[PDB]
Amino acid sequence: VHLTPEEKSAVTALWGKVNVDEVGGEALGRLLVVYPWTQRFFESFGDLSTPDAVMGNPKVKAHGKKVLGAFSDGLAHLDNLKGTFATLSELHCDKLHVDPENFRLLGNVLVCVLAHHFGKEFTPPVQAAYQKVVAGVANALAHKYH
């Protein structure tokens, strides 16, 4: 992913303020609520029967934290996303068989959550930079499919 130095600074500045305890869980949570079929991959997570149940689910929050952590690592290795996510790609593609379209969906949900948390600070230019990142992460996750 190619980010101008200005975009890099804006992305980093915003990411540094992200609530690492909640953002990831809210993104994963909204994915499960907005795209119900994704719930089939989390049978062991317990209660996902209602939106409130999904969002407040401790396992969803914990796992979402790992997801956010994965995005955080991608931001630190934008020059080598394929290598950084090699292991995760094998897991999601070869083992879980997650359809690629879903990687894109989660990426955009994360973008919606960032917009939700930062409001006006999440400007169109900031979003544009983040779309490059999530697209890059999504691509890397699905590379074992290629």
Added chain:
Amino acid sequence: VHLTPEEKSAVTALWGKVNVDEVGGEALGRLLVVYPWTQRFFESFGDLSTPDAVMGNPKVKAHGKKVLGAFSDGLAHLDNLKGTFATLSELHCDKLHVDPENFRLLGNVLVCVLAHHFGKEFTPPVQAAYQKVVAGVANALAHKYH
């Protein structure tokens, strides 16, 4: 690289019976009819105003022949689809900006065309092998997007 030895034999055996002068035009024609927005990429081809107009358009038939020629090239190098379609990937992705979902659509339209022509002969196993082929060709074409 993804087809089993048996899948390769099936694909090769059937392709030998394919009319290279008709199938491509039929596939492209149907893509334009079934997924009308694709007509936008062929503005200079003339009248595409109705199904019959599309299917009878000389430029559509002529281009389909080139498209089929590309598929034939892929079938002769099933283990290296990425390289076989490298040049075309730059054209469709970098220059034409064709959304990759359309590559998958054309692939499945080709499969429908093969089923239409071969009927009973286009058995489930034969189809399965071909789904591997068209998915591989679509992936190769979207390579510049990866």
Added chain:
Amino acid sequence: VLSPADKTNVKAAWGKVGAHAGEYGAEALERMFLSFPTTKTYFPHFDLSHGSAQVKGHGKKVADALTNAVAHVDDMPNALSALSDLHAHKLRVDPVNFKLLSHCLLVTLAAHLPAEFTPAVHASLDKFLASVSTVLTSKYR
């Protein structure tokens, strides 16, 4: 959204399926399971062996459901409500799978009714199946 012509095309082509309902439905399912093995995941306790009686029976159910959808093309949400409860609420089927089965249904029809499978009819059937898929994958209650 189906055009008047789409509705006319769907009714005429599906009308030609007649007694071949279970047969085509079963073939479409078998084609899907063989071409896209991940789809087998939705039927963990099924006998999916080639020619199995269970798949023959299920294919008949799927076919009959489509016949019903065809008869109620102007109010599918109402007519297919029970099927939506199943696929969307309980099974939570990924819509990508509906695209796979719909494509396999088209391949099956193309293999059995060449004269009826014209580009225009092909186009109409694709829209119809996409509409059915949208209804079955949406939770509207």
Added chain:
Amino acid sequence: VLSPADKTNVKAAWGKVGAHAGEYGAEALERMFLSFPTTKTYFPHFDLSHGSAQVKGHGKKVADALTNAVAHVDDMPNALSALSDLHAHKLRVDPVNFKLLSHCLLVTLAAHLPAEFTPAVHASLDKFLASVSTVLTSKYR
């Protein structure tokens, strides 16, 4: 297919836009043009520079069209026939682009109406926009 709950969620959320119609519509477009440059090829005759008057005015048209869609949520194909003629018949917009603008609309709503953008409401809005998208990309006349 929208549930009775989806319809009320959309009406309540979009109803908050009010006098911000043009502002939000313009922003959604700006977000789309900047984030997904390819979408700009559908507006070659437009002045697409940030804050251009043409984009502001067009953003208003899009926003108002959505307000009309909300008002006719039970009969969109009929109420949106004119826009379908434009986007499906004349412009032949690829459906992927509707997904992009829909996403940018959700982002805009999330950034301006945090209290309205709950998970359930977010779900309803996505379904709503996907519905509008289907009508605008389908040729049903």
